[PDB]
C-alpha cells in the first residue's frame, strides 16, 4: 500500500555556548525538503521549484516574517537555557574493562558525552600500530558505549594499559592488564 | 559547531499516526503520547527540570496533516520510496554469565517510520520488560530506533530481534548469543 | 522552565 | 468577529446558564476570561485544538466543550458565587505565531 | 509569565500627553500587548511586541517601548482625546508559550476638558 509522509524539523544550532546561534525550520515531504526558513536569510527561500509557489505566498505576510526571524532569540536560546541544565552539563563517566576475546579488548561503557579518547599502551609505550575501534556507538538512552581491540599476540611479563579520558574525569582512568 | 536541538514532527497517511519529539545531539528529550495527549521524558528525571504543554505538539501534527494533504495533491500523488532499515543486535554493556544485562535492537537508516518489531527468546515471543524508544531523526532525514530487552545471560539462551517493514523482502533476523 | 515549541505555518490552500 | 450572546443574561440561582460564542475568523485556539472589577481578566477555560480543552486558573464550577472549531460554550454551574460577573471570549490562530487574542463583546450575568 | 499594572486610575487633561505604566515579570524575549476596552464592551489589540524592534506604534496614534532593563512597557500617546477615556490593559504572552495571555490589572483613564 501506497505512503505518503510531510515532515517538519526545527533546528537550532550553537556555535562558542549560544553566542552564535542558528535556525532552520525546514519542511519535507517524502524525504525531500521543499521550503526552509533559515535564521541567517531572514525570509522563507524554496529549496524545489516545489516550494518555490508556498515560499512566495509566505513572505507576502510581512507580520510571518518579523516573528520567525526571533525564534533565534525566543525559541533557540529559550530552550537551550532551559535543558542546557541537564543535557550541555551532562557528564556519567564511562565504565571501563579489559579483556581478551577468545586478543585484547579495551571496553568502556555508558559515558557522555559523546567525545572520548581512548589509547592503548605497551610497557608504558604507547602502541599505535593494532589499534581496531568500533567507534562511538550510540546507546539511545543517553548513554554511548565503544570497544578499542589491540592486535597484539603477546609475552609473558608484559603490561598492556588502556587509557580513557574524558570530560567527566579530569586525571585518566586506566586499567591494566599483565600477560 | 558545538550543540543541534531539533524538534522533529511528522504525520503519516494513510496510517494516520504522527509523532512530535526533541532532539539533543542524538539523543531524544522527549516526545508526546499523541493517545494519551502526554509529554514523555526520556528519562523520568527531566520532569524536575523543565516543562512541557503537551497540547502544543497536537496542534502542530494537525497543521502536519493539513500540509500533507495538500502536498501530496501538488505532486501527482507520488508515494514515498521505502529504504529498508539495517539492524544491529549488541548488548549494553560487556556480557556476563550472571549478571542481569540488557539487549540493544537498533533499527538504522530507513523510511517510512512504521516497523513490526519482535523479540525472540530460544525462538518464542519475548514481552517481559521490554521498552522501545519512539521514531528518531538522521541527519539524511531517514530514521532510526532502539528496542531493549532485558535479560540474564545464559549458556542456553539465543535471542534474535524481528524487524519487519516494507523495504524488506522478507522479515530481517538479528542474531545474537552467547 | 517551560520548552517553548515552534509553529509549523499551515501551507496556503 | 466574535460574536457572544445574550449579551445580559439575568440568571435565577441554581441554574446552569450557557454563554455562547461563535467564531467565523477561522481561529484554531479559543478562550474565557472572567473580567471582575478592578482585577483584571482571569483565564476560566481554553481550547487549543478540536475536541480538548484544559483548565485555567479559576475553573471551579466552569466546563466547556469543543465540538466545533467555531463555537466554544461555556456553561455556569452553581458551583460558586463567582457568577455575578462579565464573561469575555477570544480566539486566535497558530500559523507562524501564536496569533494575538482576538475579543468578542463579552456577557454579564447576574443573580 | 506575569504582569502588573501600578497606576490603578489615570486622570489627565485633554491634549496632555499619555503614559499609563506597566512592568512584567522577569522574561527574556516575552510577547506582550497593550488593550484598550470602553466600558461593557471588549478588549481591542493597541499593540504587540514578540521582538527585534523597541518601539512600536498602534491604533490611534499610540505607541510603546520595551525597555529591556527597564522591565517595562509603557504606553503613549503625544496627544491624549477625550475619545480615550477607558479602562486599559496591559498583558503578556505567558510563558514558554500559547496562545494564553495575562492580564495586568488594568489601569482606567479618564479625561478632563
Known amino acids: 500500500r501506497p505512503r505518503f509522509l510531510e515532515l517538519l524539523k526545527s533546528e537550532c544550532h550553537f556555535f562558542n555556548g549560544t553566542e552564535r546561534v542558528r535556525f532552520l525550520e525546514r519542511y519535507f515531504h517524502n524525504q525531500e525538503e521543499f521550503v526552509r526558513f533559515d535564521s541567517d536569510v531572514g525570509e522563507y527561500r524554496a529549496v524545489t521549484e516545489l516550494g518555490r509557489p508556498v515560499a512566495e505566498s509566505w513572505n507576502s505576510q510581512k507580520d510571518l516574517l518579523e516573528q520567525k526571524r526571533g525564534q533565534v532569540d525566543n525559541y533557540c536560546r529559550h530552550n537551550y537555557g532551559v535543558v542546557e541544565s541537564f543535557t550541555v552539563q551532562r557528564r556519567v563517566h564511562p565504565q571501563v574493562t579489559v579483556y581478551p576475546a577468545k586478543l585484547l579488548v579495551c571496553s568502556v561503557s555508558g559515558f557522555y558525552p559523546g567525545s572520548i579518547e581512548v589509547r592503548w599502551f605497551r610497557n608504558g609505550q604507547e602502541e599505535k600500530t593494532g589499534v581496531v575501534s568500533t567507534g562511538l556507538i550510540h546507546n539511545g538512552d543517553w548513554t554511548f558505549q565503544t570497544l578499542v581491540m589491540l592486535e597484539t599476540v603477546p609475552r609473558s611479563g608484559e603490561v598492556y594499559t588502556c587509557q580513557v579520558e574524558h570530560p567527566s574525569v579530569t586525571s585518566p582512568l586506566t586499567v591494566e592488564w599483565r600477560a | 559547531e558545538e550543540h543541534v536541538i531539533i524538534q522533529a514532527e511528522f504525520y503519516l497517511n494513510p496510517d494516520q499516526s504522527g509523532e512530535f519529539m526533541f532532539d539533543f545531539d542524538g539523543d531524544e528529550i522527549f516526545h508526546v503520547d499523541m493517545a494519551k495527549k502526554e509529554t514523555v521524558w526520556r528519562l523520568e528525571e527531566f520532569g524536575r527540570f523543565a516543562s512541557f504543554e503537551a497540547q502544543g505538539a497536537l496542534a502542530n501534527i494537525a497543521v502536519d496533516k493539513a500540509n500533507l494533504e495538500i502536498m501530496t495533491k501538488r505532486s501527482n500523488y507520488t508515494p514515498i520510496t521505502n529504504v529498508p532499515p539495517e539492524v544491529t543486535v549488541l548488548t549494553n554493556s560487556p556480557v556476563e554469565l550472571r549478571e542481569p544485562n540488557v539487549l540493544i535492537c537498533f533499527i538504522d537508516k530507513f523510511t517510512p517510520p512504521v516497523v513490526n518489531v519482535t523479540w525472540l527468546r530460544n525462538g518464542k515471543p519475548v514481552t517481559t520488560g521490554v521498552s522501545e524508544t519512539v521514531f528518531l531523526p538522521r541527519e539524511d532525514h531517514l530514521f532510526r530506533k532502539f528496542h531493549y530487552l532485558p535479560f540474564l545471560p545464559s549458556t542456553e539462551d539465543v535471542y534474535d530481534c524481528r524487524v519487519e517493514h516494507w523495504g524488506l523482502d522478507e522479515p530481517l533476523l538479528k542474531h545474537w548469543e552467547f | 522552565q517551560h520548552i517553548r515549541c515552534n509553529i509549523p505555518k499551515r501551507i496556503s490552500a | 468577529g466574535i460574536t457572544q450572546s445574550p449579551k445580559y443574561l439575568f440568571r435565577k440561582e441554581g441554574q446552569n446558564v450557557t454563554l455562547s460564542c461563535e467564531q467565523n475568523?477561522?481561529?484554531?485556539?479559543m478562550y474565557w476570561y472572567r473580567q471582575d472589577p478592578g482585577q483584571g481578566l482571569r483565564l476560566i477555560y481554553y481550547?487549543?485544538?478540536?475536541?480538548?480543552?484544559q483548565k485555567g486558573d479559576i475553573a471551579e464550577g466552569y466546563s466547556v466543550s469543543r465540538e466545533k472549531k467555531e463555537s466554544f460554550p461555556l456553561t455556569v454551574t452553581s458551583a460558586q458565587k463567582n457568577p455575578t460577573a462579565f464573561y469575555l471570549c477570544?480566539?486566535?490562530?497558530?500559523?507562524?505565531?501564536?496569533?494575538?487574542?482576538?475579543f468578542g463583546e463579552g456577557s454579564r450575568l447576574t443573580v | 509569565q506575569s504582569v502588573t499594572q501600578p497606576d490603578i486610575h489615570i486622570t489627565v487633561s485633554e491634549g496632555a500627553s499619555l503614559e499609563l505604566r506597566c512592568n512584567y515579570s522577569?522574561?527574556?524575549?516575552?510577547?506582550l500587548f497593550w488593550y484598550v476596552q470602553s466600558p461593557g464592551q471588549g478588549l481591542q489589540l493597541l499593540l504587540k511586541?514578540?521582538?527585534?524592534?523597541?518601539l512600536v506604534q498602534g491604533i490611534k496614534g499610540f505607541e510603546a517601548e520595551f525597555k529591556r532593563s527597564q522591565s517595562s512597557f509603557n504606553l503613549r500617546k503625544p496627544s491624549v482625546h477625550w475619545s480615550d477615556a477607558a479602562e486599559y490593559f496591559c498583558?503578556?504572552?505567558?510563558?514558554?508559550?500559547?496562545?494564553?495571555?495575562?492580564f495586568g490589572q488594568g489601569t482606567t483613564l479618564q479625561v478632563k476638558p
Open positions: 477570544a480566539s486566535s490562530l497558530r500559523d507562524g505565531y501564536t496569533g494575538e487574542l482576538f
Open positions: 475568523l477561522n481561529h484554531d485556539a
Open positions: 481550547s487549543q485544538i478540536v475536541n480538548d480543552f
Open positions: 522577569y522574561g527574556a524575549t516575552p510577547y
Open positions: 511586541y514578540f521582538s527585534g524592534d523597541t
Open positions: 498583558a503578556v504572552g505567558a510563558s514558554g508559550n500559547t496562545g494564553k495571555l495575562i
